[PDB]
Amino acid sequence: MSNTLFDDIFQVSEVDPGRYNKVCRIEAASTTQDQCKLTLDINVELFPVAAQDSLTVTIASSLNLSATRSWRPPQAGDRSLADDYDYVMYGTAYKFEEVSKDLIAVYYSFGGLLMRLEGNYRNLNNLKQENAYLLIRR
Amino acid sequence: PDREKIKLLTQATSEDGTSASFQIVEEDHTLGNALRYVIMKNPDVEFCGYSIPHPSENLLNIRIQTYGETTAVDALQKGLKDLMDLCDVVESKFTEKIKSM
Amino acid sequence: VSRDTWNTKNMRSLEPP
Amino acid sequence: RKSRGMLGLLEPPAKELQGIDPDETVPDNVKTSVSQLYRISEKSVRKFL
Known about the structure:
This is part of a larger assembly, with chains A, B, C and D.
Chain A: E1 4-16, E2 23-30, E3 37-43, E4 54-60, E5 87-90, E6 92-100, E7 103-110, E8 113-119, E9 133-137
Antiparallel strand pairs in A: 1-2, 1-4, 2-3, 3-8, 4-9, 5-9, 6-7, 7-8
Chain B: E1 6-9, E2 19-24, H1 29-40, E3 45-51, E4 61-66, H2 72-100
Antiparallel strand pairs in B: 1-2, 2-4, 3-4
Chain C: no helix or strand
PDB class: transcription
Keywords: targeted DNA integration, Ty1 retrotransposon, Ty1 integrase, RNA 19 polymerase III, transcription
Chain A: DNA-directed RNA polymerases I, II, and III subunit RPABC3
């Protein structure tokens, strides 16, 4: 509940594969938030995206609501987020930049799959930290 | 008692097991890849993989990393036994079909 | 064909030299 | 900082109330926004030097 740093419904404008066969840079404008734009690289082989479809994009930290140092998948029967989401990526917000007054852009890298999120008032929710899960459902 | 066949590489071994490199002489991609597949089918293994450091040496370093439940030696023994069972099954099916035809 | 030879025959050649 | 309305302290302050933090009147919103965009810690400056 309090682990979601961002959540919105986006209308996908463009989906173009630029010299790629399984990754597409989708462009999506928000619904009810006219200042909120979204550019996102998605594995369209696992999560196919077409033009002009509705995407629910949720940015969450601590998806699951030893000192082994190697990531371990959660148990199969674990009540967690991403159960109600088709496509989930894990990355890091590595840059915050201002695009104008009361409008900033936040950049995430999900292993090289980039995402640029544009908005105005999120200063108390989005931080430059490795803990950032991106959840998309259709 | 062959003490020169498989060795534990102590420099590449963690504390309390769960991470170990085994050097197996006179083995190559044949045993390496099958063993890696079988060991990776073990739910406790988080990292399996072999490398032949040089083509001029009959050598094979296989790296096993597990979670805290079992040790890399345990996982390696389990993978070897499971490969044995796999080959048993293949032998039985092949013999049955060759007899039947 | 269609007859086993391994069951009857001791595989001496498969021992390690 | 001065584009956010709050005082852009390029020069050190010099007044009677100089000791107080001039970011108190900011309602905790553009402060965290500024810390979100640019946040230069002293450890970072010393490490760069």
